[PDB]
Copies of this chain bind each other. A is one copy, B any other.
Amino acid sequence: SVFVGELTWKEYEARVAAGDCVLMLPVGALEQHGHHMCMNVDVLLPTAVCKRVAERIGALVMPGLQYGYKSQQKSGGGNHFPGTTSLDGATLTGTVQDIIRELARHGARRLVLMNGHYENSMFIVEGIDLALRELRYAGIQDFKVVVLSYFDFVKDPAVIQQLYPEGWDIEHGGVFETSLMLALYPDLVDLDRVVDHPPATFPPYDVFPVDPARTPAPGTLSSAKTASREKGELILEVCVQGIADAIREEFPP
């Protein structure tokens, strides 16, 4: 297994003892994803990508963070939806910080933080900064971290044309995530429940408290009507290949 949770402490210790072991931590969220998909999507996708990348490059995968930062209207629909269960920023930051501190204690020095929930980004960044500050105080400056959101690896316009024949800041519960889920966890997707509505549009600013009227009723920012397993397989291949390459580049054996 590539999952740290499924290893004995002796197996884990042996792996870290190699001195060049790469650890990966999926960071997601429990968030509404429309009428057609489950709420753990942001955990499932990065965990699936991590699993495959780890198998491909020989890394290990830490237990994923199941709860993330508050859902924002323009990226996740808004934190007023039922089901969505969010943490305060300080809580998420402290979790990332504590884990890095512990990995450093083990002797590990390479970590990939794979985000699957857009809103988590800056809180993961602060967690990394605070942890690295402490490590320096402990006399450790050789701990290296690579942070990324798996979905940022699908930029190639060529690939985009394939996913959107008819032609990113509106891909919550849409074609992208739904396609990936159809390729990975089809049993957790019910396409017949998709509400085919027009893409959500927003002015160049944000309003608080969140106004429910500004988010499409289903909670999705765009329709997943044209999602497919074929598209998900393409997305999966692009992400896994790209991320695996980045890791080989940043953490060579």
Contact = CB atoms under 8 A, between A and B. Distances in A.
A242 B148 contact: no
For this chain, the copies found in one complex come to 6
A67 to B, nearest CB: 7
A34 B38 CA distance: 35
Given A13-B83, A43-B63, A94-B88, A30 B5 contact: yes
A125 interface: yes
Given A4-B30, A119-B122, A9 B82 contact: yes
A27 B106 CA distance: 23
A99 to B, nearest CB: 6
A204 B155 contact: yes
B81 A9 contact: yes
A203 interface: yes
A193 interface: yes
Contact of A91 (B36, B43, B95): B95
Contact of A66 (B5, B69, B137, B148): B5
Contacts of A39: 4-9, 12
Interface string A2-18: 01111111101100100
Interface in A61-117: 62-67, 69-70, 72, 81-91, 93-95, 97-99, 102-103, 106-107
A104 to B, nearest CB: 11
Interface in A27-50: 30, 32-40, 43
Nearest to A126: B89
A144 interface: yes
Contacts of A183: none
A197 to B, nearest CB: 15
Contacts of A146: 205-208
Which of A3, A129, A155 has most chain B Cβ within 10 Å? Answer: A129
B125 A72 contact: yes
Contacts of A7: 38-39, 83
A200 interface: no
Given A7-B39, A67-B99, A138-B136, A246 B204 contact: yes
5 contacts: A9-B35, A12-B82, A63-B67, A72-B125, A144-B207
Given A91-B95, A205-B246, 15 more contacts: A8-B36, A8-B190, A13-B82, A30-B62, A40-B63, A70-B126, A85-B99, A121-B122, A125-B206, A125-B208, A137-B138, A141-B209, A144-B207, A145-B208, A148-B205
